[PDB]
Design a protein around this ligand. Structure first.
Ligand SMILES: [Mg+2]
Length: 282
């Protein structure tokens, strides 16, 4: 990180109407919170209250479903709350989905035992679309988990293609890959690191192709550099904007006409990731 100084990024203003002029009717916020308790202490809920999304998706809660912070009972506009944590009941990984309205159905996991033990996926079916939030397994230090990650990628893509065959799909969360060079500050130095291996990048391309899905942010901002969602807490990385875009909203092609905007909330503190926000005119 000795070669990088600051690179400026200012997320554009919120575009809240679609290309057809329809006002957004759905606001979804996604956030890897780096520990639910830690994030709450760091005032994450105060930020959520200001953002006022219709649906909030959280990853890396690191929190047993039996040990939820009581502060989550102070979110009256997000009163339907669903959680999945590792089946061993330990405090790591973990996702949550909090919604203004109750979904038609909530499910956990991807229908594959091997991949359903670490609290990584919630599926929330609504009238006109299905929402999936995910915390994708990291490839690990020394890439020791890369083989598992490739198995996960395949199982997950097949699962999502199935869902999308029935209803339009929105996938959000920490997908643990920077797809292209534009998606991280230092592509050259990270090609052998978790999050930017050729294996992971191509797995992401495979996901877009197979389902298929569009990367909402990149669709809208195809040439925009320095837009990241994660910065290591070390090396003063966030202040220099030496980051990675690891957090996405991926959409069925049929939802593109409903796409108003896909935001990166760069200034929102409380984790080593920042929130992302999607506006749809459904
Ligand atoms: Mg973390």
């Amino acid at each position: 990180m000795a070669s990088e100084g600051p690179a400026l990024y200012e997320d554009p203003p919120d575009q809240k109407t679609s290309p057809s002029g329809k006002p957004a009717t759905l606001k979804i916020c996604s956030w890897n919170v780096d520990g639910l308790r830690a994030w709450i202490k760091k005032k994450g809920l105060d930020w959520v209250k200001e953002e006022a999304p219709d649906i909030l998706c959280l990853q890396e809660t690191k929190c047993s479903e039996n040990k939820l912070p009581a502060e989550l009972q102070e979110l009256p506009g997000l009163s339907h709350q669903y959680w999945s944590a590792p089946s061993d009941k330990e405090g790591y990984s973990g996702v949550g989905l909090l919604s203004r309205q109750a979904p038609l159905k909530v499910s956990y996991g991807i229908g594959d035992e091997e991949h359903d033990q670490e609290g990584r996926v919630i599926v929330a079916e609504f009238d006109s679309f299905v929402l999936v939030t995910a915390y994708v397994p990291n490839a690990g230090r020394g890439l020791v988990r890369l083989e598992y990650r490739q198995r996960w990628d395949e199982a997950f893509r097949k699962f999502l293609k199935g869902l999308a065959s029935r209803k339009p799909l929105v996938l959000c969360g920490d997908l643990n890959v920077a797809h292209e060079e534009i998606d991280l500050r230092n592509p050259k130095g990270n090609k052998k690191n978790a999050g930017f291996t050729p294996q992971e990048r191509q797995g992401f391309g495979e996901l877009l192709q197979a389902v298929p899905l569009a990367d909402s942010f990149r669709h809208l901002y195809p040439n925009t550099p320095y837009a990241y969602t994660f910065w290591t807490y070390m090396m003063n990385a966030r202040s220099k904007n030496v980051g990675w875009r690891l957090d996405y909203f991926l959409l069925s092609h049929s939802l593109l006409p409903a796409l108003c905007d896909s935001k990166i909330r760069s200034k929102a503190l409380g984790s080593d990731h920042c929130p992302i926000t999607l506006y749809l005119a459904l």
